[PDB]
Amino acid sequence: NCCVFRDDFIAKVLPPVLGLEFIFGLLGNGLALWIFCFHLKSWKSSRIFLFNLAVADFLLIICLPFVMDYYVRRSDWKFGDIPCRLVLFMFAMNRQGSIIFLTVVAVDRYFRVVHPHHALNKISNWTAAIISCLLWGITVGLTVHLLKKKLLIQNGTANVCISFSICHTFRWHEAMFLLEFFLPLGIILFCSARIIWSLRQRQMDRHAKIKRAITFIMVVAIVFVICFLPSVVVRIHIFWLLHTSGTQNCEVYRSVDLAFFITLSFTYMNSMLDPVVYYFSSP
Numbered sequence: 001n002c003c004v005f006r007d008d009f010i011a012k013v014l015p016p017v018l019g020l021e022f023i024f025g026l027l028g029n030g031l032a033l034w035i036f037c038f039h040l041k042s043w044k045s046s047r048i049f050l051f052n053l054a055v056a057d058f059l060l061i062i063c064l065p066f067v068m069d070y071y072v073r074r075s076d077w078k079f080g081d082i083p084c085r086l087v088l089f090m091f092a093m094n095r096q097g098s099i100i101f102l103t104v105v106a107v108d109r110y111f112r113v114v115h116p117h118h119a120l121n122k123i124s125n126w127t128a129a130i131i132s133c134l135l136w137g138i139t140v141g142l143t144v145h146l147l148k149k150k151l152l153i154q155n156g157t158a159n160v161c162i163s164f165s166i167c168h169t170f171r172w173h174e175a176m177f178l179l180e181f182f183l184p185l186g187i188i189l190f191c192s193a194r195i196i197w198s199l200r201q202r203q204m205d206r207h208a209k210i211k212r213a214i215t216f217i218m219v220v221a222i223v224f225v226i227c228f229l230p231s232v233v234v235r236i237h238i239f240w241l242l243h244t245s246g247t248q249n250c251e252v253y254r255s256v257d258l259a260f261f262i263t264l265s266f267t268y269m270n271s272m273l274d275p276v277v278y279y280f281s282s283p
């Protein structure tokens, strides 16, 4: 009897917003994959990591119509009782996989400006594919547990495919939702701080085009914070009522859960702005 409910205001927000993001997501990341496969004449180590970033976003954009149909049925999973776990495993894997390949690019850019002579900058394509394959391995390590757990809680006659329910339990999925964001913020922000400082200490900033390069190092951090921070702060807010003054009354959870469910739409926006900021902007 965990806190699960639905409202009508979200039905006037999510179906238009989620559908609109799907149009931009498919045209953006779909076109980006076209250039990588048939227009990139030299596949270096740096472009390999960026390619995986587009694959993760595309695997999430293709699943946007399925989750969109969930709301239009008044929050009812009409079909796919077993695919409910599948359609949710493909969502957390894409979200976490995008973050992992988002920090790697930031880490890769850090080693090219602060340690120009390091041997890591000259790794061959294969070595950049063995590392990339191992990164995909750890993505499913923290996500395949969705299949083991049972899902589709029945509210009498309705079906809801939700794993972010506001119920007082030490769930690994909820805890991993907080580690997937705080830890990269301690690496992405730190790496982007030295890149925007080493390029300034050595006076390379002035009288060069590199001003644009410094600008887009901060743009990446801005997009990451805007897309993921609001979802986290409303998740921690739920934990406050869950730990103290909660677990009994479901009315206090109504406001936060509705905000959390809507704020989750911020996450599928980083999969739309990534081709605009990462690939297309760069020459």
Ligand SMILES: C[C@@]1(c2ccccc2)OC(C(=O)O)=CC1=O
Pocket (backbone or CB within 6 Å): 066, 067, 070, 087, 088, 091, 092, 095, 161, 162, 163, 164, 264, 267
């Ligand atoms: C909205 C939702 C979803 C996913 C697939 C099918 C229905 C609903 O997306 C997530 C997620 O982004 O991880 C958790 C969900 O409950």
